[PDB]
Amino acid sequence: LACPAERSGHVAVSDGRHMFVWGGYKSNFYLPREELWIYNMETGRWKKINTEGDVPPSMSGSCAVCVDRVLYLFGGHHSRGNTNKFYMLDSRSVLQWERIDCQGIPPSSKDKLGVWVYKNKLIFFGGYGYLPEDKVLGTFEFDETSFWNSSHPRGWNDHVHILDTETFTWSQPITTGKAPSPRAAHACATVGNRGFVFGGRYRDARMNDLHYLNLDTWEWNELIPQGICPVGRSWHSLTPVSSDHLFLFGGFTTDKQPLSDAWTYCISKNEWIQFNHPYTEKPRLWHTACASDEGEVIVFGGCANNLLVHHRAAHSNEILIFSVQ
Ligand SMILES: O=C(O)CNC(=O)Cc1csc(-c2ccc3ccccc3c2)n1
């Protein structure tokens, strides 16, 4: 049966029963832009389709959502750099991509960010990319390691941007509270009107902090769980599994250890619980995770070692199924 190629930095979005996989890169360039891979969470079978229309460039680090079987794609890194273009693919009724001429001030061109979905709003936070074209709300910190290797320097931001799907208009909310530090390769998860974010890379650390932005008031809150917390990391996944639990898997520590640990964050108790699973010998970073209607968390792709050593990188095509409910 047909089987998608290994990759990291891809996107994966789900309607609870089907998982849509697009993009990413591997070793041994970018996976083909026109392909969309569909994994049936109930039958474990893959199915590939060719998409047409305004097919986005081949990219790593893009940020995607699925809302009522409409897929939206923002940002990423292609052969000629980062982007801030916005695409839509309606997976309801050959599938055609639409590139949206958004109104308003878009985010800076960037990748490795996250998104919360709340009613008509797609809310994007953070990431890695070029200096912004405007003194938009937030801060931006250059990554000094990008000064002497490329032609365009890059850095981290803490920006929050709203894409309103009633009008495809970009805006930025005026927030209160301590926003998280600028960061990339963090993970975001949404429960109700709370947009959680955990970890990420910033300057010389991969972080262990946990915050949530209230998506109704726009007030930041930093969460301080008691007792043992997971080690700081980037390139991990964070996924809602109930109205009270976020599921964490994998990532990459400050001192460059690939991770195979898994935790559940209980929101009501403000406590982490380590989760026991049979994939302890399968660390993953820059994988994706999607929750199914059937209580599972489906992890796909990602790299089993330090992907920054690109000629030795072990990118995966495996499906890891976590039975959290
Ligand atoms: O460092 C983190 O945890 C997340 N990264 C950042 O925040 C910014 C950054 C700075 S360089 C880089 C990066 C990414 C992927 C690569 C894949 C192959 C080869 C080199 C690669 C280099 N990313």
Author numbering: 26 to 53, 61 to 125, 129 to 360
Could you give the paper's own sentences about this structure?
Specifically, KLHDC2 recognizes substrates possessing a Gly-Gly C-terminal degron (C-degron) sequence. Ligands were identified that engage the C-degron binding site in KLHDC2, subjected to structure-based improvement, and linked to JQ1 for BET-family neo-substrate recruitment.
We therefore tested if expanding the phenyl group into naphthyl or bi-aryl analogs, which could potentially better fill this pocket, would improve binding. Amongst the various naphthyl analogs tested, SJ46411 exhibited excellent activity with a Kd of ~260 nM measured by isothermal titration calorimetry (SPR Kd = 0.5 μM, TR-FRET IC50 = 3.9 μM, ΔTm = 6.0 °C). We also note that the 2-naphthyl substitution demonstrated greater activity than the 1-naphthyl substitution (SJ46411 vs SJ46145). A co-crystal structure of SJ46411 bound to KLHDC2 confirmed the predicted stacking of the hydrophobic face of the naphthyl ring in the binding pocket. The structure further showed the di-Gly portion of the molecule allows a water-mediated bridge between the thiazole ring and acid moieties. Consistent with this view, SJ46411 and SJ46421 alone were only able to inhibit KLHDC2 substrate ubiquitylation and largely inactive towards other the Kelch family E3 ligases.
